[PDB]
């Protein structure tokens, strides 16, 4: 049977998934303008948000 | 006494036609002989920074030393040397060292600002990074060399003398000596009559001294590992009359505890790198004590002080050590490491930037381990032994904790003795 939707924590991180998407939004663009080096810190940040974004994608569909 | 060409962590041919020239924390250099020449292939552990390359040898360079900036090759017979930088900025250079009859190059070394070439007669010829020759110095014969970008460490031995150690620095104006030919009591290998048919005879023929590996630590302390399987570290190297060798690791006790009390000889320890708490090694399983083609994965082995009994561990039973027995070993390990880390920061400063968190955690575990021995002395009613343990505390918060252990053990006279130590330290601090 259905369980109580814990809305309080969800919106608390739903702000967070907006923020780091905007954090990488500028800092890539700052890396393009400084390009006339390290390709580590971009790729990890790109995959980490969407994996958490993947989890709630299933989580609301089963509702 | 005929000498032999020595290299760092070099392995002999054995029953094959191929062997390793050198081995360190940067990588390994091996050679493959196919009936007429040698093929030197240099492989590294860090595939991302540098690119693996290989070339054909037409001179048979057997002496090699690897550092962070280049690769040096040397010939013991003709005296021809060659330095190969990894980066494309500097070009290759070739020079032939003149050698007389009998005299051979036994050990080579390479730093980014100085070139060190040692011979069998003890001639010390030093060159710079551009090839300008310096003054020729005549000393004792050199059999082993190690360096980490700035200093020269030489080991001397002849037929009418014994093993010694020297520590010097090749400055811009002149050569300055920290240690000048002080005696080194490292044990020699005892080859018996039954070793002539043993399979490990080939390792001692290429290296008669039994020096498996030697290198400097991450914080600047000299280390050596001979045939006696005991890791020796040089303490108080800034003071020539106060220099002491302290054994902090032994392989002969660690193999017996991990194997469940067995007596096998298929497990060994080959030192690669040591950065203040863990000696990096390869677990070689087999009859030979030297590695061959493809290297297994590296494991981690933390250092332990060799202080145990053998009959007492069997009565109390991977072999496990109890709480009470491990407090004595933890006290000896933390006391040596805290003294060396304190003198390094007050004279050389920080190197990585996180030394203060390591020092705070080490000093906290030092006072905590002493309280376990302090609690055991109060339980056996030995008030006098508990008094001497209180003076070894460093932190002021550890003295407050000693009062609570004393009150629980019903010893009111021991409580007042802790307070006299507290008043004496406050008076000395205000002077």
């Amino acid at each position: 049977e259905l369980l109580p939707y814990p809305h309080q924590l969800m919106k608390r991180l739903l702000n967070r998934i907006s923020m780091q998407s905007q954090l990488i939004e500028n800092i890539s663009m700052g890396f393009l303008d400084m390009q006339n080096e390290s390709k580590l810190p971009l790729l990890c940040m790109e995959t980490e948000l969407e994996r958490l974004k993947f989890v709630i994608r299933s989580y609301i569909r089963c509702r | 006494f005929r000498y032999m060409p020595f290299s760092p962590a070099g392995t002999p041919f054995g029953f094959t036609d191929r062997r390793y020239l050198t081995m360190n924390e940067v990588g390994y250099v091996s050679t493959v002989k196919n009936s007429e020449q040698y093929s030197i292939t240099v492989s590294f552990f860090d595939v991302g920074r540098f690119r693996e390359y290989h070339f054909e040898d037409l001179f048979g360079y057997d002496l090699c030393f690897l550092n962070e900036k280049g690769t040096l090759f040397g010939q013991s017979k003709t005296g021809q040397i060659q330095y190969r930088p990894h980066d494309s900025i500097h070009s290759n250079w070739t020079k032939i060292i003149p050698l007389q009859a009998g005299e051979r190059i036994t050990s080579v070394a390479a730093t980014p600002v100085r070139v060190i070439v040692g011979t069998s007669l003890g001639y010390f010829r030093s060159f710079n990074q551009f090839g300008v020759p310096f003054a020729v110095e005549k000393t004792s014969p050199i059999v082993a060399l190690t360096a980490q970008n700035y200093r020269v460490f030489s080991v001397h031995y002849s037929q009418f003398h014994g093993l010694s150690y020297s520590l010097s620095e090749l400055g811009t104006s002149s050569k300055r000596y920290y240690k000048r030919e002080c005696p080194l009591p490292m044990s020699l290998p005892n080859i018996n009559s039954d070793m002539k048919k043993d399979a490990n005879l080939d390792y001692y023929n290429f290296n008669p001294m039994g020096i498996k590996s030697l290198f400097f630590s991450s914080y600047g302390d000299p280390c050596i590992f001979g045939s006696d399987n005991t890791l020796l570290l040089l303490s108080k190297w800034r003071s020539p009359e106060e220099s002491k060798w302290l054994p902090i690791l032994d392989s002969n006790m660690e193999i017996w505890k991990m194997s469940g009390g067995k007596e096998t000889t298929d497990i060994h320890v080959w030192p690669l790198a040591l950065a203040y708490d863990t000696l990096n090694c390869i677990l070689v399983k087999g009859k030979h004590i030297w590695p061959e083609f493809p290297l297994p994965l590296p494991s981690e082995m933390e250092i332990r002080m060799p202080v145990f009994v053998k009959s007492k561990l069997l009565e109390e039973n991977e072999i496990q050590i109890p709480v009470s027995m491990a407090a004595e070993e933890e006290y000896l390990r933390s006391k040596v490491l805290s003294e060396l880390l304190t003198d390094t920061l007050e004279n050389d400063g920080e190197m990585y930037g996180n030394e203060n968190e390591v020092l705070a955690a080490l000093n906290g575990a030092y006072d905590k381990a002493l309280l376990r021995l302090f609690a055991s002395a109060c339980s056996d009613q030995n008030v006098e032994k508990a008094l001497s343990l209180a003076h070894e505390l460093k932190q002021d918060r550890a003295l407050t904790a000693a009062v609570k252990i004393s009150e629980r053990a019903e010893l009111p006279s021991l409580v007042k003795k802790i307070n006299n130590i507290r008043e004496a330290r406050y008076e000395q601090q205000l002077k």
Binding site: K39, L43 | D17, V32, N34, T41, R51, E52, S88, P294
Partner: protein, 553 residues
């Protein structure tokens, strides 16, 4: 001028972003060695973590419709062997835009005639000039160097003749036949060794491409007999056998034969291509179909233990041929059989050498599938190319044998008609060459794709590989399957019976410029390789009349 480590780091920083900064490489499918060079370059770009785009192009006229129409911010174009002869900068206009330019191609041309503009006067064409040719026409330091800038009535008159003196040395040059002098396997593998990446898969890969040129030339890989030897010893994985390891891909050496694909199978269909080897001697059918029956049916060839006898205890018989042909050595002296060769294994799954391995890649590239038919013919060869490129994994096993069983009928197909055109006796030595026109036979469909045609010539150049102590000239064939008489006519090379002293590359491409320059009356050079053109039916007869008089050798 291009040091090998330098261009790699230079092309690294130019496109290493996580966007559409896409560098794109181009490759022909019409060559086997063209494939294997590219495959090893891609995988290191994977582990150097860069985005890419791979497109095949089969046709030289197709290059405009694949580049010059779809470009946005491609700064780094890459190409494998296309423009050693025709200048692409005249073929494709690129105006100078933004000295430190904005988009720079490289080139990996493998051919002998070069183009002076592409090395000297380089501004977008950063060619691979390192220690390949140190004598890049070393007399050129005053010919074009005075062609660039070009009382004076007697002085300039001499100066025009010096230009005319420069004109002849640019006239005899740019008038040579072509080959590939050095394989593209040789260059990039040497480049990676300057970087230093140790994988035996690379050492398995680079030797494949140079093995492909074993049937087109001789002494090119005869220089590489040491460079095969040192690397397999310097990259020694093991001194012991260290047996029963399913992995680790051990590398060895074993002798092997012109009689081919034996370790895969069929000492049965060896009987045909043993007679190929006797087609190298003095016959095609007659004496051999007696003569083979001293050396072959000595053992009846079984059904179950022939999985074991011509797999395993043929080592008693390879020894026996090894002790048959040692006494056929001072007496027969025919040294087209014993060869050093190279082999590999997989731990299990049989021993597979590289001699037969290039054979499967050719046939599997062939089969395995107005102006409305050529489009649906050109879409085929790109597609069936694609299923050969992924043949270099372990993941293809039960498709690997598919080409194998395909190969041992295609030769049985190609030999079925080669014996026909011999017995028809339609080869005519007119004066210079021999001409043969396959007007119509059976199974004409397997002659559209040109990779079979060089093999048919490779069988046909060896029927005439007897003594022939005058007129060592190869042939020109003719065949037609489709409408309007397309006629993919081609030329071959003359051959040597293992005695190249004379410089025999080609004379036809010099004449191919001539006939194409005459009238433009439905002639085509749209196919890539210059050794193949097209003709019309009413033009092949005035083709030869222009060729029997124009002696340009």
């Amino acid at each position: 001028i291009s040091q090998f480590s330098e261009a790699y780091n230079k092309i690294l920083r130019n496109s290493s972003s996580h966007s559409s900064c896409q560098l794109v490489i181009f490759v022909s499918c019409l060559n086997i060695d063209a494939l294997c060079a590219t495959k090893m370059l891609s995988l290191l770009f994977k582990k150097q973590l860069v985005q890419s785009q791979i497109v095949p192009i089969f046709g030289y006229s197709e290059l405009r419709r694949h580049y010059s129409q779809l470009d946005d911010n491609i700064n780094s174009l890459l190409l494998v062997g296309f423009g050693g002869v025709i200048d692409l900068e005249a073929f494709l206009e690129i105006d100078p835009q933004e000295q430190s330019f904005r988009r720079d191609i490289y080139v990996l041309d493998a051919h002998r005639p070069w183009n002076l503009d592409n090395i000297f006067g380089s501004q977008i064409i950063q060619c691979f000039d390192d220690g390949t040719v140190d004598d890049t026409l070393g007399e050129q330091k005053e010919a074009y160097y005075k062609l660039l800038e070009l009382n004076d009535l007697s002085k300039r008159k001499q100066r025009k003749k010096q230009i005319h003196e420069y004109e002849g040395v640019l006239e005899e040059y740019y008038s040579q036949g072509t080959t590939v002098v050095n394989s593209i396997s040789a260059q990039i593998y040497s480049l990676l060794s300057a970087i230093g990446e140790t994988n035996l898969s690379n050492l398995w890969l680079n030797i494949l491409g140079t093995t492909s040129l074993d049937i087109a030339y001789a002494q090119v890989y005869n220089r590489l007999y040491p460079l095969l030897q040192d690397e397999v010893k310097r990259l020694t994985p093991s001194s012991r056998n260290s047996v029963k390891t399913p992995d680790t891909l051990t590398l060895n050496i074993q002798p092997d034969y012109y009689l081919f694909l034996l370790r895969h199978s069929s000492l049965y269909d060896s009987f045909y291509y043993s007679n190929y080897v006797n087609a190298k001697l003095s016959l095609w059918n007659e004496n051999g179909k007696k003569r083979l029956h001293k050396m072959f049916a000595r053992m009846g060839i079984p059904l179950s233990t022939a999985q074991e006898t011509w797999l395993y205890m043929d080592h008693s018989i390879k020894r026996e041929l090894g002790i048959i042909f040692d006494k056929n050595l001072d007496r027969y002296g025919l040294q087209d059989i014993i060869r050093d060769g190279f082999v590999r294994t997989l731990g299990y799954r049989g021993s597979i050498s590289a001699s037969e391995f290039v054979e499967a890649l050719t046939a599997l590239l062939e089969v395995g599938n107005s102006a409305q038919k050529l489009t649906n013919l050109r879409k085929r060869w790109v597609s069936n190319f694609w299923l050969s490129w992924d043949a270099l994994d372990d993941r293809k096993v039960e498709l690997l044998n598919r080409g194998i069983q395909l190969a041992q009928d295609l030769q049985r197909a190609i030999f079925n008609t080669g014996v026909a055109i011999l017995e028809k006796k339609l080869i005519k030595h007119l004066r210079i060459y021999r001409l043969c026109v396959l007007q119509d036979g059976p199974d004409l469909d397997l002659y559209r794709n040109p990779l079979t045609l060089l093999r048919l010539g490779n069988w046909l150049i060896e029927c005439c590989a007897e003594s022939e102590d005058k007129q060592l000239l190869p042939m020109v064939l003719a065949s037609i399957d489709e409408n309007t008489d397309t006629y993919l006519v081609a030329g071959l090379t003359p051959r040597y019976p293992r005695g190249t002293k004379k410089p025999i590359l080609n004379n036809f491409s010099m004449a191919f410029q001539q006939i194409t320059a005459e009238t433009d009356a439905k002639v085509r050079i749209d196919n890539f390789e210059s050794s193949i053109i097209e003709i019309r039916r009413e033009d092949l007869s005035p083709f030869l009349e222009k060729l029997t008089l124009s002696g340009l050798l």
